[PDB]
Amino acid sequence: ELKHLPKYKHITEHAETYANIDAGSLELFLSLFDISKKMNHVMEHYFAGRGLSEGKFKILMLLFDAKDHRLSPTELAKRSNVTKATITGLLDGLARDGFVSRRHHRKISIELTTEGKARLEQFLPGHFSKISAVMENYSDEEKDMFVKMLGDLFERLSVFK
Amino acid sequence: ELKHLPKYKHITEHAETYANIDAGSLELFLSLFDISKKMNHVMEHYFAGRGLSEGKFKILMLLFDAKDHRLSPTELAKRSNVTKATITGLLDGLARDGFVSRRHKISIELTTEGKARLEQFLPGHFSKISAVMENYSDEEKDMFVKMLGDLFERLSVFKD
């Protein structure tokens, strides 16, 4: 996408004329929107580079974290941000791809295969190093303040319906 | 799509057991990714409600602020942070939608419907943004925008 974060000098000076609107708030909102487009853009291709999706990788990460690498499908739906009908389609693919296996023991459980666990252990180190690279040179109290602000922004965005 | 930003400290503090990853760094990154998916979602439908996009709306902005509401397409590419190949596609849509007109060194102009549609939309669009940043001080926001700058460039490393 883009290389460096764009400032929107034109839009900023224009909204200052409007009654209840300050400059900085606009720059902060537009930056947050820029990073969002690149966030989502870069991420969709990264997981593509590995034959995956946002959803399928979050499922794989749920299992890798579960005791015995087993979780019910409904539990996987709850633990991600999607409905049961959705994870059913993903689970179908992951099963076909051989990453995951659907087992009974009545109610059904979903378990990581040995190849799926193996392929995951070959990928995760680079994935964590890249994330580490992004938050480099940020202090501890800084990271917390950032997420605390992302907390407020997320909920107020509903008023942006 | 979701109600509140998901909290990750529990999953995160467990990831220090996984690998060489810090708590805040992982939590921040996951938070940034959740907010990102949300904003792309909400904003896509919001501008859909008005027949626009982020891209088309940013052009109308440029036009609305220019003297005589006229700007060359090349100036629009430079000022919107988008490439000429892209702005040509946006411009085409706006032209068909009736927001803009191409006149003769070529010129892009707001139609009167476009200016009207813009003047009726901008006040509500600005109050919602202000509301989103209720009680943040100058030094808070300037740090927040500062941090957003470094993350913006470093996301390039997710080129696998």
CSV table of C-alpha atoms in Angstrom, one decimal, chain A:
chain,number,residue,atom,x,y,z
A,1,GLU,CA,0.0,0.0,0.0
A,2,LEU,CA,1.6,3.2,1.2
A,3,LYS,CA,5.1,3.7,2.7
A,4,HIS,CA,4.7,6.6,5.2
A,5,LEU,CA,1.6,7.8,7.1
A,6,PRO,CA,-0.1,10.7,5.1
A,7,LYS,CA,-1.1,13.9,6.8
A,8,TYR,CA,-4.3,15.5,5.5
A,9,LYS,CA,-3.4,19.2,5.7
A,10,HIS,CA,-6.2,20.2,3.4
A,11,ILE,CA,-9.0,18.4,5.2
A,12,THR,CA,-7.6,19.5,8.6
A,13,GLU,CA,-7.7,23.3,8.0
A,14,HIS,CA,-11.1,23.1,6.4
A,15,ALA,CA,-12.9,21.4,9.3
A,16,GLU,CA,-11.5,23.9,11.8
A,17,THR,CA,-14.1,26.3,10.3
A,18,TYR,CA,-16.9,24.0,11.4
A,19,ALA,CA,-18.4,24.8,14.9
A,20,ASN,CA,-17.5,21.9,17.2
A,21,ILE,CA,-14.6,20.4,15.4
A,22,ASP,CA,-10.9,20.7,16.2
A,23,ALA,CA,-7.9,20.0,14.0
A,24,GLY,CA,-6.0,17.2,15.9
A,25,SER,CA,-9.1,15.0,16.2
A,26,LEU,CA,-9.4,14.9,12.5
A,27,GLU,CA,-5.7,14.1,11.9
A,28,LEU,CA,-6.0,11.3,14.5
A,29,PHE,CA,-9.2,9.9,12.9
A,30,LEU,CA,-7.8,10.0,9.4
A,31,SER,CA,-4.5,8.4,10.5
A,32,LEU,CA,-6.5,5.7,12.2
A,33,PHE,CA,-8.4,5.1,9.0
A,34,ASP,CA,-5.2,5.0,6.9
A,35,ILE,CA,-3.6,2.4,9.2
A,36,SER,CA,-6.8,0.4,9.1
A,37,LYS,CA,-6.8,0.2,5.3
A,38,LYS,CA,-3.1,-0.8,5.2
A,39,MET,CA,-3.6,-3.1,8.2
A,40,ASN,CA,-6.3,-5.1,6.5
A,41,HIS,CA,-4.6,-4.9,3.2
A,42,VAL,CA,-1.1,-6.1,4.2
A,43,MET,CA,-2.7,-8.8,6.4
A,44,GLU,CA,-5.0,-10.4,3.9
A,45,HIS,CA,-2.0,-11.0,1.5
A,46,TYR,CA,0.4,-12.2,4.3
A,47,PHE,CA,-2.0,-15.0,5.3
A,48,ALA,CA,-2.7,-15.6,1.6
A,49,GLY,CA,1.1,-16.2,1.2
A,50,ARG,CA,0.6,-19.2,3.4
A,51,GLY,CA,-2.6,-20.5,1.8
A,52,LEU,CA,-4.8,-19.2,4.7
A,53,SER,CA,-7.3,-16.5,5.8
A,54,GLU,CA,-7.9,-14.3,8.8
A,55,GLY,CA,-10.5,-16.8,10.1
A,56,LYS,CA,-8.7,-20.0,9.4
A,57,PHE,CA,-5.5,-18.8,11.1
A,58,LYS,CA,-7.5,-17.6,14.2
A,59,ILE,CA,-9.1,-21.1,14.4
A,60,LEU,CA,-5.6,-22.7,14.1
A,61,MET,CA,-4.4,-20.4,16.9
A,62,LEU,CA,-7.4,-21.3,19.1
A,63,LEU,CA,-6.5,-25.0,18.8
A,64,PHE,CA,-2.8,-24.5,19.3
A,65,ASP,CA,-3.7,-22.8,22.6
A,66,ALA,CA,-6.3,-25.3,23.8
A,67,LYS,CA,-5.5,-28.0,26.2
A,68,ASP,CA,-4.9,-31.2,24.1
A,69,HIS,CA,-5.4,-28.9,21.0
A,70,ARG,CA,-9.2,-29.7,21.2
A,71,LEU,CA,-12.2,-27.3,21.2
A,72,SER,CA,-15.8,-27.8,20.3
A,73,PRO,CA,-16.9,-25.9,17.1
A,74,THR,CA,-19.4,-23.8,19.0
A,75,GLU,CA,-16.6,-22.9,21.4
A,76,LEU,CA,-14.4,-22.0,18.5
A,77,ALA,CA,-17.2,-19.7,17.2
A,78,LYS,CA,-17.5,-18.0,20.6
A,79,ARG,CA,-13.7,-17.6,20.9
A,80,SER,CA,-13.4,-16.0,17.5
A,81,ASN,CA,-15.8,-13.3,16.4
A,82,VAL,CA,-18.0,-15.4,14.1
A,83,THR,CA,-21.2,-17.4,14.1
A,84,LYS,CA,-21.5,-21.2,14.1
A,85,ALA,CA,-22.6,-21.3,10.5
A,86,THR,CA,-19.4,-19.4,9.6
A,87,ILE,CA,-16.9,-21.6,11.5
A,88,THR,CA,-18.7,-24.6,10.0
A,89,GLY,CA,-17.5,-23.6,6.6
A,90,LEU,CA,-14.0,-22.8,7.7
A,91,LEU,CA,-13.8,-26.1,9.7
A,92,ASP,CA,-14.9,-27.8,6.6
A,93,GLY,CA,-12.0,-26.4,4.6
A,94,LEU,CA,-9.4,-26.9,7.3
A,95,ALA,CA,-10.5,-30.5,7.6
A,96,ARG,CA,-10.2,-31.0,3.8
A,97,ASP,CA,-6.8,-29.2,3.8
A,98,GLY,CA,-5.8,-31.7,6.5
A,99,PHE,CA,-4.9,-29.1,9.1
A,100,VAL,CA,-7.7,-30.1,11.5
A,101,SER,CA,-9.7,-33.2,12.3
A,102,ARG,CA,-13.3,-33.5,13.5
A,103,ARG,CA,-13.7,-36.1,16.2
A,104,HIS,CA,-16.5,-37.4,18.5
A,105,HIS,CA,-16.3,-38.5,22.1
A,106,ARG,CA,-22.8,-37.1,20.8
A,107,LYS,CA,-20.9,-33.8,20.9
A,108,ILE,CA,-18.0,-33.2,18.6
A,109,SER,CA,-14.5,-31.8,19.2
A,110,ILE,CA,-12.0,-30.2,16.7
A,111,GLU,CA,-8.4,-31.2,17.1
A,112,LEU,CA,-5.2,-30.0,15.4
A,113,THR,CA,-3.5,-32.7,13.2
A,114,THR,CA,0.2,-33.5,13.6
A,115,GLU,CA,0.9,-31.9,10.2
A,116,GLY,CA,-1.2,-28.9,11.2
A,117,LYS,CA,0.6,-28.5,14.5
A,118,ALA,CA,3.9,-29.0,12.7
A,119,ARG,CA,3.1,-26.5,9.9
A,120,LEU,CA,2.1,-24.1,12.6
A,121,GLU,CA,5.3,-24.5,14.5
A,122,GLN,CA,7.3,-23.7,11.4
A,123,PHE,CA,5.3,-20.5,10.8
A,124,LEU,CA,4.8,-19.0,14.3
A,125,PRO,CA,8.4,-17.9,15.0
A,126,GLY,CA,8.5,-15.5,12.0
A,127,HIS,CA,5.0,-14.3,12.8
A,128,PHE,CA,6.0,-13.3,16.3
A,129,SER,CA,9.3,-11.7,15.2
A,130,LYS,CA,7.5,-9.4,12.8
A,131,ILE,CA,5.0,-8.4,15.4
A,132,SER,CA,7.9,-7.7,17.8
A,133,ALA,CA,9.5,-5.6,15.1
A,134,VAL,CA,6.3,-3.4,14.9
A,135,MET,CA,6.2,-2.6,18.6
A,136,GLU,CA,9.9,-2.0,18.9
A,137,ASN,CA,11.1,1.1,20.9
A,138,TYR,CA,7.7,1.5,22.7
A,139,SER,CA,7.7,1.7,26.4
A,140,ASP,CA,5.5,-0.5,28.6
A,141,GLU,CA,3.3,2.3,29.9
A,142,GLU,CA,3.0,3.6,26.3
A,143,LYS,CA,1.6,0.3,24.9
A,144,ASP,CA,-1.0,0.3,27.6
A,145,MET,CA,-2.0,3.9,27.0
A,146,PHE,CA,-2.4,3.1,23.3
A,147,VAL,CA,-4.6,0.1,23.8
A,148,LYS,CA,-6.6,2.0,26.4
A,149,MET,CA,-7.3,4.6,23.7
A,150,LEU,CA,-8.1,1.9,21.1
A,151,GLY,CA,-10.6,0.7,23.7
A,152,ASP,CA,-12.5,4.0,23.7
A,153,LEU,CA,-12.3,4.5,19.9
A,154,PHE,CA,-13.7,1.0,19.2
A,155,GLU,CA,-16.9,1.6,21.1
A,156,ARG,CA,-17.5,5.2,20.0
A,157,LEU,CA,-17.2,4.1,16.4
A,158,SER,CA,-20.7,2.7,16.7
A,159,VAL,CA,-21.9,6.3,16.7
A,160,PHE,CA,-20.2,6.3,13.3
A,161,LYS,CA,-22.9,3.8,12.1
